[PDB]
Design an enzyme around this catalytic site. Structure first.
Site, PDB file in Angstrom:
ATOM      1  N   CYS B 108      53.275 -25.153 -63.357  1.00  0.00           N
ATOM      2  CA  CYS B 108      52.271 -25.699 -62.473  1.00  0.00           C
ATOM      3  C   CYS B 108      51.100 -26.358 -63.193  1.00  0.00           C
ATOM      4  O   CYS B 108      50.378 -25.713 -63.988  1.00  0.00           O
ATOM      5  CB  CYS B 108      51.698 -24.621 -61.580  1.00  0.00           C
ATOM      6  SG  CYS B 108      50.423 -25.312 -60.478  1.00  0.00           S
ATOM      7  N   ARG B 111      46.691 -25.554 -62.218  1.00  0.00           N
ATOM      8  CA  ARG B 111      46.188 -24.180 -62.355  1.00  0.00           C
ATOM      9  C   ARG B 111      44.679 -24.094 -62.603  1.00  0.00           C
ATOM     10  O   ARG B 111      44.092 -22.993 -62.548  1.00  0.00           O
ATOM     11  CB  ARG B 111      46.987 -23.414 -63.412  1.00  0.00           C
ATOM     12  CG  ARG B 111      48.329 -22.863 -62.925  1.00  0.00           C
ATOM     13  CD  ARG B 111      49.082 -22.265 -64.100  1.00  0.00           C
ATOM     14  NE  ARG B 111      49.644 -23.260 -65.019  1.00  0.00           N
ATOM     15  CZ  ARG B 111      50.129 -22.980 -66.238  1.00  0.00           C
ATOM     16  NH1 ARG B 111      50.130 -21.722 -66.690  1.00  0.00           N
ATOM     17  NH2 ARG B 111      50.650 -23.945 -67.007  1.00  0.00           N
ATOM     18  N   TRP B 280      48.084 -28.653 -52.734  1.00  0.00           N
ATOM     19  CA  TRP B 280      48.172 -30.044 -52.301  1.00  0.00           C
ATOM     20  C   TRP B 280      49.023 -30.788 -53.319  1.00  0.00           C
ATOM     21  O   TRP B 280      49.288 -30.267 -54.400  1.00  0.00           O
ATOM     22  CB  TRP B 280      46.796 -30.682 -52.098  1.00  0.00           C
ATOM     23  CG  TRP B 280      45.909 -30.571 -53.259  1.00  0.00           C
ATOM     24  CD1 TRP B 280      45.960 -31.320 -54.424  1.00  0.00           C
ATOM     25  CD2 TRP B 280      44.812 -29.646 -53.417  1.00  0.00           C
ATOM     26  NE1 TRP B 280      44.963 -30.906 -55.283  1.00  0.00           N
ATOM     27  CE2 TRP B 280      44.246 -29.886 -54.701  1.00  0.00           C
ATOM     28  CE3 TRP B 280      44.251 -28.643 -52.596  1.00  0.00           C
ATOM     29  CZ2 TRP B 280      43.149 -29.148 -55.190  1.00  0.00           C
ATOM     30  CZ3 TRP B 280      43.145 -27.915 -53.079  1.00  0.00           C
ATOM     31  CH2 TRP B 280      42.611 -28.169 -54.364  1.00  0.00           C
ATOM     32  N   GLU B 285      54.915 -36.455 -57.293  1.00  0.00           N
ATOM     33  CA  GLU B 285      55.907 -35.622 -56.635  1.00  0.00           C
ATOM     34  C   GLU B 285      56.517 -36.425 -55.495  1.00  0.00           C
ATOM     35  O   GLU B 285      57.741 -36.347 -55.246  1.00  0.00           O
ATOM     36  CB  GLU B 285      55.251 -34.358 -56.072  1.00  0.00           C
ATOM     37  CG  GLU B 285      54.816 -33.304 -57.073  1.00  0.00           C
ATOM     38  CD  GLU B 285      54.156 -32.121 -56.402  1.00  0.00           C
ATOM     39  OE1 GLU B 285      54.893 -31.155 -55.990  1.00  0.00           O
ATOM     40  OE2 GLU B 285      52.898 -32.149 -56.283  1.00  0.00           O
TER      41      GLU B 285
HETATM   42  C1  HEM Z   1      46.143 -26.794 -55.725  1.00  0.00           C
HETATM   43  C2  HEM Z   1      46.946 -27.874 -55.826  1.00  0.00           C
HETATM   44  C3  HEM Z   1      48.228 -27.776 -56.674  1.00  0.00           C
HETATM   45  C4  HEM Z   1      48.826 -28.750 -57.348  1.00  0.00           C
HETATM   46  C5  HEM Z   1      48.355 -30.176 -57.491  1.00  0.00           C
HETATM   47  C6  HEM Z   1      50.030 -28.227 -57.982  1.00  0.00           C
HETATM   48  C7  HEM Z   1      50.874 -28.975 -58.751  1.00  0.00           C
HETATM   49  C8  HEM Z   1      52.153 -28.611 -59.048  1.00  0.00           C
HETATM   50  C9  HEM Z   1      53.190 -29.515 -59.471  1.00  0.00           C
HETATM   51  C10 HEM Z   1      53.030 -31.045 -59.608  1.00  0.00           C
HETATM   52  C11 HEM Z   1      54.294 -28.775 -59.682  1.00  0.00           C
HETATM   53  C12 HEM Z   1      55.682 -29.278 -60.140  1.00  0.00           C
HETATM   54  C13 HEM Z   1      56.652 -29.255 -58.963  1.00  0.00           C
HETATM   55  C14 HEM Z   1      57.810 -30.259 -58.993  1.00  0.00           C
HETATM   56  O1  HEM Z   1      58.115 -30.835 -60.068  1.00  0.00           O
HETATM   57  O2  HEM Z   1      58.450 -30.488 -57.914  1.00  0.00           O
HETATM   58  C15 HEM Z   1      53.966 -27.387 -59.437  1.00  0.00           C
HETATM   59  C16 HEM Z   1      54.813 -26.308 -59.589  1.00  0.00           C
HETATM   60  C17 HEM Z   1      54.487 -25.020 -59.269  1.00  0.00           C
HETATM   61  N1  HEM Z   1      53.267 -24.591 -58.771  1.00  0.00           N
HETATM   62 FE1  HEM Z   1      51.628 -25.730 -58.319  1.00  0.00          FE
HETATM   63  N2  HEM Z   1      50.106 -26.903 -57.731  1.00  0.00           N
HETATM   64  C18 HEM Z   1      49.053 -26.603 -56.856  1.00  0.00           C
HETATM   65  C19 HEM Z   1      48.814 -25.379 -56.277  1.00  0.00           C
HETATM   66  C20 HEM Z   1      49.681 -24.313 -56.480  1.00  0.00           C
HETATM   67  C21 HEM Z   1      49.566 -23.033 -55.832  1.00  0.00           C
HETATM   68  C22 HEM Z   1      48.511 -22.634 -54.769  1.00  0.00           C
HETATM   69  C23 HEM Z   1      50.528 -22.257 -56.343  1.00  0.00           C
HETATM   70  C24 HEM Z   1      50.875 -20.782 -56.013  1.00  0.00           C
HETATM   71  C25 HEM Z   1      49.936 -19.907 -55.637  1.00  0.00           C
HETATM   72  C26 HEM Z   1      51.286 -23.026 -57.288  1.00  0.00           C
HETATM   73  C27 HEM Z   1      52.318 -22.524 -57.995  1.00  0.00           C
HETATM   74  C28 HEM Z   1      53.325 -23.250 -58.522  1.00  0.00           C
HETATM   75  C29 HEM Z   1      54.580 -22.688 -58.990  1.00  0.00           C
HETATM   76  C30 HEM Z   1      55.090 -21.237 -58.953  1.00  0.00           C
HETATM   77  C31 HEM Z   1      55.356 -23.874 -59.486  1.00  0.00           C
HETATM   78  C32 HEM Z   1      56.797 -23.820 -60.015  1.00  0.00           C
HETATM   79  C33 HEM Z   1      57.627 -24.205 -58.782  1.00  0.00           C
HETATM   80  C34 HEM Z   1      59.127 -24.159 -59.024  1.00  0.00           C
HETATM   81  O3  HEM Z   1      59.589 -23.906 -60.182  1.00  0.00           O
HETATM   82  O4  HEM Z   1      59.874 -24.398 -58.028  1.00  0.00           O
HETATM   83  N3  HEM Z   1      50.722 -24.272 -57.401  1.00  0.00           N
HETATM   84  N4  HEM Z   1      52.635 -27.309 -59.084  1.00  0.00           N
HETATM   85  C1  LIG Z   2      66.072 -22.164 -57.014  1.00  0.00           C
HETATM   86  C2  LIG Z   2      64.780 -22.960 -57.171  1.00  0.00           C
HETATM   87  C3  LIG Z   2      63.645 -22.531 -56.481  1.00  0.00           C
HETATM   88  C4  LIG Z   2      62.442 -23.228 -56.612  1.00  0.00           C
HETATM   89  N1  LIG Z   2      61.335 -22.825 -55.940  1.00  0.00           N
HETATM   90  N2  LIG Z   2      62.384 -24.329 -57.411  1.00  0.00           N
HETATM   91  C5  LIG Z   2      63.462 -24.777 -58.107  1.00  0.00           C
HETATM   92  C6  LIG Z   2      63.275 -26.013 -58.963  1.00  0.00           C
HETATM   93  C7  LIG Z   2      63.666 -27.261 -58.161  1.00  0.00           C
HETATM   94  C8  LIG Z   2      63.363 -28.544 -58.907  1.00  0.00           C
HETATM   95  N3  LIG Z   2      63.241 -29.528 -57.843  1.00  0.00           N
HETATM   96  C9  LIG Z   2      63.136 -28.955 -56.523  1.00  0.00           C
HETATM   97  C10 LIG Z   2      62.929 -27.482 -56.845  1.00  0.00           C
HETATM   98  O1  LIG Z   2      61.534 -27.202 -57.032  1.00  0.00           O
HETATM   99  C11 LIG Z   2      60.639 -27.623 -55.973  1.00  0.00           C
HETATM  100  C12 LIG Z   2      59.226 -27.151 -56.294  1.00  0.00           C
HETATM  101  C13 LIG Z   2      58.251 -27.724 -55.282  1.00  0.00           C
HETATM  102  C14 LIG Z   2      56.839 -27.781 -55.846  1.00  0.00           C
HETATM  103  C15 LIG Z   2      55.938 -28.263 -54.731  1.00  0.00           C
HETATM  104  C16 LIG Z   2      54.437 -28.087 -54.950  1.00  0.00           C
HETATM  105  C17 LIG Z   2      53.856 -26.813 -54.722  1.00  0.00           C
HETATM  106  C18 LIG Z   2      52.473 -26.699 -54.858  1.00  0.00           C
HETATM  107  C19 LIG Z   2      51.717 -27.836 -55.222  1.00  0.00           C
HETATM  108  C20 LIG Z   2      52.341 -29.078 -55.424  1.00  0.00           C
HETATM  109  N4  LIG Z   2      53.674 -29.179 -55.314  1.00  0.00           N
HETATM  110  C21 LIG Z   2      64.690 -24.108 -57.993  1.00  0.00           C
END
Ligand code: HEM
Ligand SMILES: Cc1cc(N)nc(C[C@@H]2CNC[C@@H]2OCCCCCc2ccccn2)c1
Ligand code: HEM
Ligand SMILES: Cc1cc(N)nc(C[C@@H]2CNC[C@@H]2OCCCCCc2ccccn2)c1
Ligand SMILES: C[C@H](O)[C@H](O)[C@H]1CNc2nc(N)[nH]c(=O)c2N1
Ligand SMILES: C[C@H](O)[C@H](O)[C@H]1CNc2nc(N)[nH]c(=O)c2N1
Ligand SMILES: [Zn+2]
Lengths: 402, 404
Positions: B108, B111, B280, B285
């Site tokens: 993320c 953060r 947000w 994305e």
């Molecule tokens: C506040 C605005 C936020 C922005 C701009 C942001 C931005 C992002 C971005 C750009 C990604 C990559 C996702 C992708 O490639 O599809 C991501 C992943 C992630 N973010 Fe954030 N984030 C925000 C808030 C949060 C919040 C509130 C949380 C949780 C409390 C969070 C937790 C995560 C986690 C766990 C991932 C990994 C998701 C995955 O592997 O599927 N983020 N974030």
């Molecule tokens: C099994 C699995 C679960 C998961 N949550 N994420 C993945 C990774 C894949 C890589 N592409 C789609 C999916 O992850 C989507 C994560 C969405 C992040 C959205 C977001 C969340 C908060 C702030 C800004 N953007 C795999």
């Protein structure tokens, strides 16, 4: 045991079994990944020698043969009494191509079998090194029709200093440190510019002054040699639709020839083994011209383009980078000098990944280096999982000689 | 030097050492033999030790490490696990852990916001109907008419024998993906399966490129129940370009609220299988991944055609030119709609500041380089030039198997 590698665009999966053949540990541990980091006796030498001679005879389908037994015997005989050995030219040729094939940071590996290898192991002086270096450049440049090549100087020896090329590439633009902290010309090359001056070079004062080579024969002060301007092909940069671009007076050289890496084959080490291919356009367009700690021309271009510079959300940076990459592609094409754009390069790399899967059961690759510096997800490599590990023969980094 | 990873920023020429990785208790997928950092996917005595460690983290965060409240809470946890196999978190412990899980998330880039998270406790929830109410409340609060607010809603934890709370959808808002007779997909190809599951469980499907899916919500030991979101709750942004007038005519749109609903939130051994969180968007994305991936909306060729680019040759950079404009359209349209969004320059600059905060605070920051660097304009952002150490700290958001 064996890593499952998925492509997320096509849903396809392979298993890398080639990594089982790695013998050199990398930087990662189960506790933390360190993959985004840029930088890191008879019985041992003998086993690397054997393994490599095996690789060689297998590669010519003469594995098990008489000629194979008799070569392993020679090597054994030579190590057992001298603590080292020497490679036959053909074995050298096989090793150099394999070192390129194994280079996990290289997106151009589709070309790996097409490599002109100059044997320069009968070199005894900086003067000689310089002669060889000039023949390499002449051959590699080929009037714009670039051809890949490596020139391999004398291996390291227990007794004495290494043969070295001090320059990081055969062609480099000077960087002149200024009283007011800033740099003029290429900031990457400040230290090497200063070393040249120290060892006696008359400096210029331009942004594109081609540096002289500092060449070092074992245990001698390095020597200075100017490349004849005729040998160094350069490309003036213009844009196809923007007239003012050419006015920036920007330019770049045709030949990307790396000259500070060490070539390891069968446990022997070649400390001066310069190699060259051709450029992928993003190296010049994006990194060399747009990195903030390089020529850093983004704002100048964006201001020429009359872009709204006051905010990041207008994407003035992304818009100017594209025009600069396009100017590089256009200018090289117009000068009929070889270049590959990042889309064509990564497409060919996917092809290469597929070949190596059938041939060797995997392919070592460094995702962070393979994916281009702009438009990453627009290229197919972004979506490809990749496994990174060290095989031998290999190109390695080595300490700077001073 | 120190025997902790040395970490360099190649733009600024500055060095740090990461000492925080020492705290990692979970192995990732790499070994000395091979790096696997680019893969998307890598109780008893065990519970107690994870629990003890979280409690210590908690008491440290409130500077009461070693105190009587600290050792009594330790004792309280041990006793509770001793007789019941499990234990329960105090409210302020859940708030701390949810924030720390976000703070610990290596993928993320957002953060810098980690300390500002609204935590909705929903550990009282006992039906699929009630999950729906909590989720609606979450969406309402988080969306805030466009002035977006980070939030997480936390549903009951896993229990022995007893089944999980689960949200079947991977995000709270998703567009349907309908498989056609000619093999193609209308809508979002990422969502084909969940679309097919919704239909199976009785959803009357539409036929658009942007149909909002209903929620498939599962209470303990029940088949999932289906709930349609009231459309006034799902804020969407129609997409237009500031100068290319024809772009609005494509009828492209995206929703405002990115809310991940399939991750497991783990705190001190306890596993919250339903704990959707939202923030947000960063504009890439939407404008780059969701709209341009070949295996998603795939609109690059369409846009490049409208822009009259030479699409018959890689070397015209038509793909790069079209991506830029689609990204500009996403930013422009969100700004116009007064919906919070962040561009990839602003976001990554903000993440450099966060890296520097965490160096001072904790001695490092777990970070997954390939995810942190944006999918367009990589080396134009400062994180590209920043080395990063990736490792797993707890609390954490983890992936988990699909409930079907
Ligand atoms: C506040 C605005 C936020 C922005 C701009 C942001 C931005 C992002 C971005 C750009 C990604 C990559 C996702 C992708 O490639 O599809 C991501 C992943 C992630 N973010 Fe954030 N984030 C925000 C808030 C949060 C919040 C509130 C949380 C949780 C409390 C969070 C937790 C995560 C986690 C766990 C991932 C990994 C998701 C995955 O592997 O599927 N983020 N974030
Ligand atoms: C099994 C699995 C679960 C998961 N949550 N994420 C993945 C990774 C894949 C890589 N592409 C789609 C999916 O992850 C989507 C994560 C969405 C992040 C959205 C977001 C969340 C908060 C702030 C800004 N953007 C795999
Ligand atoms: C055929 C044309 C070639 C192309 C288009 C190409 C492409 C590239 C690119 C884009 C990089 C990353 C460069 C950077 O970001 O600085 C690279 C790295 C590398 N290439 Fe190639 N390559 C080519 C030929 C070669 C040849 C002939 C060799 C050796 C025989 C080679 C060995 C390497 C090595 C060892 C690296 C890593 C360099 C380092 O760590 O400094 N490549 N290649
Ligand atoms: C100490 C050190 C040595 C070295 N060779 N390489 C590095 C890595 C850094 C990353 N930026 C500068 C340097 O690498 C430059 C390599 C340029 C390769 C050019 C090329 C070679 C072949 C084909 C196309 N292009 C460090
Ligand atoms: C810190 C990071 O590893 C570093 O900036 C890398 C990233 N990827 C790269 N990729 C290539 N091809 N060349 C590079 O110099 C770099 N730099
Ligand atoms: C193969 C590779 O790991 C995969 O395509 C990754 C690369 N980087 C990413 N980075 C982000 N932020 N999101 C992603 O989905 C991905 N995908
Ligand atoms: Zn790794």
């Amino acid at each position: 045991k064996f890593p499952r590698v998925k492509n997320w665009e096509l849903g396809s999966i392979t298993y890398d079994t080639l990594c089982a053949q790695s013998q050199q540990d990398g930087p990662c541990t189960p506790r933390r990944c360190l993959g985004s980091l840029v930088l890191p006796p008879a019985e041992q030498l003998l086993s690397q020698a054997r393994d490599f001679i095996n690789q060689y005879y297998s590669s010519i389908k003469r594995s098990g043969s008489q000629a194979h037994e008799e070569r392993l015997q020679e090597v054994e005989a030579e190590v057992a009494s001298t603590g080292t050995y020497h490679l036959r030219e053909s074995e050298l040729v096989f090793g150099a191509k394999q070192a390129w094939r194994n280079a996990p940071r290289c997106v151009g590996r589709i070309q790996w079998g097409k490599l002109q290898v100059f044997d320069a192991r009968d070199c005894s002086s900086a003067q000689e090194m310089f002669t060889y270096i000039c023949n390499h450049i002449k051959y590699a440049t080929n009037r714009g029709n670039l051809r890949s090549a490596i020139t391999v100087f004398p291996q390291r020896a227990p007794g004495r200093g290494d043969f070295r090329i001090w320059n990081s590439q055969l062609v480099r633009y000077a960087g002149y440190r200024q009283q007011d902290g800033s740099v003029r010309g290429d900031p990457a090359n400040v230290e090497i510019t200063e070393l040249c001056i120290q060892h006696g070079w008359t400096p210029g004062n331009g942004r594109f002054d081609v540096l002289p080579l500092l060449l070092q024969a074992p245990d001698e002060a390095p020597e200075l040699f100017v490349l004849p301007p005729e040998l160094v092909l350069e490309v003036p940069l213009e844009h196809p639709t923007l007239e003012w671009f050419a006015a920036l007076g920007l330019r770049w050289y045709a030949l990307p020839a790396v000259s500070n890496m060490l070539l390891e084959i069968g446990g022997l080490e070649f400390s001066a083994a310069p190699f060259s291919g051709w450029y992928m356009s993003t190296e010049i367009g994006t990194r060399n011209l747009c990195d903030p700690h390089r020529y850093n021309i983004l704002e100048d271009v964006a201001v020429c383009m009359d872009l709204d510079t006051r905010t990041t959300s207008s994407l003035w940076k992304d818009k100017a980078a594209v025009e600069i990459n396009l100017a590089v592609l256009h200018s090289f094409q117009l000068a009929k000098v070889t270049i590959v754009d990042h889309h064509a390069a990564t497409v060919s790399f996917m092809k290469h990944l597929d070949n190596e899967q059938k041939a060797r059961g995997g392919c070592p690759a460094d995702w962070a280096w393979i994916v281009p510096p702009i438009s990453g997800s627009l290229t197919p490599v972004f979506h490809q999982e990749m496994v990174n590990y060290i095989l031998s023969p290999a190109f390695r980094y080595q300490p700077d000689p001073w």
